[PDB]
């Protein structure tokens, strides 16, 4: 088993398609557990200004009682057989997955059929949930990471649905009524926009039979989004009482398509990640992280690759004190243009290995495998096998990384979002000047 043989030995993801348009897919294994869930193409990207937050609201209400299962009775099932019911709604995806035993798949799918089709939307339950969402919004206000990322989205995609947050404004939260929720679920939770993923010890034919027996009476056989526009801007929520200063700087990246994602991830793998409670410290190959550990510039930093259907954000997010924002902006831009102008071969090899490890280790356990299945059948349109990922990483070299970074980084207007004691944060002109090198 020389790695490549191990990659070939990974079982494939069989994909089917119901008459209603449900893309039933499954990956068979030998584990005695399973994770089955539907991924829907709803989210804030498909939400208008007045509807903003309806997806989060309906996701909240989904588990709190159905039509056939009144209230906690549904929950009474999930705990009775040891299942873990969970959900998450991204800006472009929504999902409700139920961890269960391999022998509980016939029931679990049934529960899923109840959650997405025969929902309740009880008015009194809506009233109880409204204040809960308000308090959750207040809790997220203290989340200086999520707040900064929402600031980045708003200041990068201003004037487009992508700028909208997942939870939506509090005004919409209090305004939203049952009619809007049922209209939203009837318009977005359509069969062609749903994929019933199931990883673990589930046989694909059994999954197909269950889906045909439960998800049959869905929609027959329309929000298709609008191409959003990137607008290099900046938001400075100067608040000196905050202890640290979260900064996020991004550029218009690629989408789920546009294979340039694979080299680009490698570049991010070169920059890497670091925080105070790390290991080697002033020895890690990342020059950014090594310098940060040497001079203690920050408490954290990361490189994200948020990519949507047609566009996406590529950049970094660092958490540091008030007296070191300028230095880390300098070093981060220096690393970006070092990769842009002369990426070398050894760093590219290290990035390839890091990306290989990320993809391989991320896809362990039934939950990440099922999530990958559901997300890939929506974004890529196909569950990309790990062998294809290996080949695509292998094709990446120094010249490819330099070219792709030049395409996406060099002389590009970034979007900046700072929160906290960000007085040191250089003005947007200085950042944009850092986005190009005079020597080169």
């Amino acid at each position: 088993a020389t790695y490549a043989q191990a990659l070939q030995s990974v079982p494939e993801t069989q994909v089917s398609q119901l008459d209603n348009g449900l893309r039933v897919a499954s990956e068979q294994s030998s584990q005695p557990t399973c994770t089955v869930g539907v991924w829907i193409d709803a989210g804030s990207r498909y939400e208008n200004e007045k509807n903003n937050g309806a997806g989060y609201f309906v996701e909240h209400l989904a588990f709190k009682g159905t039509k056939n299962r009144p209230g906690s009775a549904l929950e009474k099932e999930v705990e009775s057989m040891g299942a873990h019911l969970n959900a998450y709604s991204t800006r472009e995806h929504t999902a409700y997955y139920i961890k269960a035993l391999s022998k509980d798949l016939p029931k679990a799918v049934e529960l899923l059929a109840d959650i997405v089709q025969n929902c309740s939307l009880e008015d009194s339950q809506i009233e109880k949930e409204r204040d809960v969402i308000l308090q959750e919004l207040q809790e997220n206000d203290s989340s200086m990471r999520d707040v900064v990322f929402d600031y980045l989205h708003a200041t990068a995609f201003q004037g487009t649905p992508l700028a909208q947050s997942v939870e939506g404004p509090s005004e919409n939260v209090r305004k939203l009524s049952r009619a809007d929720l049922t209209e939203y679920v009837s318009q977005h939770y359509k069969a062609p926009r749903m994929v019933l993923a199931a990883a673990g010890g589930v046989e694909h034919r059994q999954l197909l039979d269950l889906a045909q027996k439960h998800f049959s009476s869905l929609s027959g056989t329309v929000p298709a989004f609008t191409p959003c526009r990137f607008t290099g801007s900046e938001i400075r929520h100067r608040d000196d009482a905050l202890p640290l200063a979260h900064v996020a700087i991004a550029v218009e990246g690629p989408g789920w398509a546009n294979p340039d994602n694979v080299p680009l991830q490698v570049a991010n793998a070169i920059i890497g990640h670091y925080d105070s409670t790390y290991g080697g410290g002033t020895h890690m190959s990342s020059t950014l992280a090594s310098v940060a550990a040497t001079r203690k510039l920050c408490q954290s930093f990361q490189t994200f690759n948020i990519c949507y259907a047609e566009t996406g954000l590529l950049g970094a997010h660092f958490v540091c004190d008030n007296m070191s924002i300028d230095d880390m902006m300098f070093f981060l831009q220096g690393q970006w243009m070092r990769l842009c102008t002369s990426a070398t071969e050894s760093e590219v090899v290290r990035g390839k290995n890091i990306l290989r490890n990320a993809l391989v280790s991320h896809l362990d356990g039934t939950t990440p495998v099922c999530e990958d299945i559901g997300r890939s059948l929506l974004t890529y349109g196909r569950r990309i096998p790990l062998a294809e990922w290996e080949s695509r990483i292998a094709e990446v070299d120094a010249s490819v990384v330099r070219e792709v970074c030049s395409k996406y980084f060099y002389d590009q207007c970034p979007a900046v979002a700072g929160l906290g004691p960000i007085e040191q944060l250089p003005d947007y002109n200085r950042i944009r000047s850092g986005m190009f090198w005079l020597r080169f």
Partner: protein, 54 residues
């Protein structure tokens, strides 16, 4: 605001405008702000009819 990205170019524009005015003076009316009597050898035996500074 940082001095560099804004006030360097602002002072560059100001310097260009001052250069424009100074060059107008030098190239078109060099002796506009100058007494013609200065173009005469300094004779200590004869005062100018009018004596004034610059």
């Amino acid at each position: 605001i940082p001095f560099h990205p804004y006030y360097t170019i602002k002072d560059i524009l100001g310097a260009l405008f001052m250069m424009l005015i100074l060059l107008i003076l030098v190239l078109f009316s060099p002796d506009l702000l100058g007494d013609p009597d200065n173009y005469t050898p300094a004779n200590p035996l004869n005062t100018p009819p009018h004596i004034k500074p610059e």
